[PDB]
Structure 1
Amino acid sequence: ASFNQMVTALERMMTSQQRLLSDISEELRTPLTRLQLGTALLRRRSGESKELERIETEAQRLDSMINDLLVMSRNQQKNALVSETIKANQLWSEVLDNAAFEAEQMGKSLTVNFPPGPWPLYGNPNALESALENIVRNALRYSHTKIEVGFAVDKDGITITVDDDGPGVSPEDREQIFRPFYRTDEARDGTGLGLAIVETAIQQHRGWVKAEDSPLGGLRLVIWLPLYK
């Protein structure tokens, strides 16, 4: 099919686009360190300016973001594999088992409302496995007492819903939650790349992600992935 040709062409482009991101992340360190040596010079080779202090906090922010990018890009290349057929139960049963154990260790509870069936998917098993893993990790951290995971299926695809009873996220901030480096003031008191990685991985797999208010009181994350024909 023409569609199969287009998917393969775009899959190849996604590889070259990941190679690009990781490589320039390593490259950004070189002018950043040279910039910081300039701000380190003027710090005692001239007065302790409030102006120079303001340039150093901007350089600090840049450094912080570049370091987070290196941590991110390391995995988005190492863990990047060829696209294969995988069943939803095979793919996510281990993630859900480890998450239930981690919850139990925190005195919290993880309930799987409806389990993943043998529903066929197509893509990178590690990327899809980590996409659910990052959502559930956030739920484990921010929930007060409980986490809920629910699977749904139909002719078109699989819907995964992760709920928690913690504080949620305001409707304004739920808009920017998937943005790279975005962190709510509650969390600021973590890189902010987690949900950015999740959104990209799921969009690369021809699906979508949503952040909503949870019936449990906290945050609800909804992943949709297409069924493999």
Structure 2
Amino acid sequence: MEFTEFNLNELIREVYVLFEEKIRKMNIDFCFETDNEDLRVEADRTRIKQVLINLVQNAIEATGENGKIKITSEDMYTKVRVSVWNSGPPIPEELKEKIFSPFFTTKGTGLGLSICRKIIEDEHGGKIWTENRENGVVFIFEIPKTP
């Protein structure tokens, strides 16, 4: 694929801008925090953008009107971490892994998470997971700072 080194936080801002009207519309309380303004990562920018768009879209759909979304990005030395949290329904415990299967659907293509897992784990050698937190759900991914 096509790896470059870029400021991950500029990418997150780009994705926020794409969804700003929708977030505003829905009176969603959106927060983005980082612990390093220039959060440099070597990655396929287009592919990481796709992951972010998917996670943000899912967060907006799940949280609903007057909902809450928080994105955090963190520089951890040999890796960077992005967490996307929304208030909303929890992932059932029995579905914690299954929601990442390409065969997971809802009523109908799935939540995009199988391709997010492919991008994060297969394409970038990272990790992606979910936890139920604070009356909602976080999706977390980590990618190594360099392949």
- The alignment's TM-score, normalised by the length of structure 1, stands at 0.58
Q: Secondary structure at the match of 1:168?
A: coil
Q: Secondary structure at the match of 2:47?
A: helix
Q: Which of 117, 142, 145 is the matching residue for 1:224?
A: 142
Q: Answer with 1 or 2: which has the greater Rg.
A: 1
Structure 1 residue runs of 4 or more that deviate by more than 3 Å after TM superposition: none
Matches of 1:167 and 1:180 in 2, distance apart?
A: 21
2:27 alignment counterpart: 107
Cα RMSD for the two superposed structures? 1.9
What are the equivalent positions in structure 2 for 1:150-169 lying under 5 Å apart?
150-169=72-91
1:175 alignment counterpart: 97
Contact 2:99 2:111 in 1 (8 A): no
Q: Which has the higher contact order (CA 8 A, sep 6+)?
A: 2
What are the equivalent positions in structure 2 for 1:29-178 lying under 5 Å apart?
82-114=2-34, 117-144=37-64, 145-178=67-100
Name the aligned partner's letter for residue 31 of structure 2. T
1:42 alignment counterpart: none
Q: Which of 210, 215, 221 is the matching residue for 2:129?
A: 210
1:99 to partner: Cα distance:
2.9
In terms of fraction of residues, the more strand-rich structure is 2
When residues 199 and 146 of structure 1 are mapped into structure 2, their CA distance, relative to the original with a 3 A threshold, is same
1:193 to partner: Cα distance:
5.8
When residues 114 and 84 of structure 1 are mapped into structure 2, their CA distance, relative to the original with a 3 A threshold, is closer
Instruction: Report % sequence identity.
Output: 24
Structure 1 unaligned regions, length at least 5 = 1-80
1:110 to partner: Cα distance:
1.3
1:123 to partner: Cα distance:
2.4
Name the aligned partner's letter for residue 146 of structure 2. Y
1:116 to partner: Cα distance:
6.2
Contact 1:119 1:227 in 2 (8 A): no
Name the aligned partner's letter for residue 200 of structure 1. K
Contact 1:159 1:224 in 2 (8 A): yes
The number of equivalent residue pairs is: 144
Contact 1:149 1:163 in 2 (8 A): yes
1:75 alignment counterpart: none
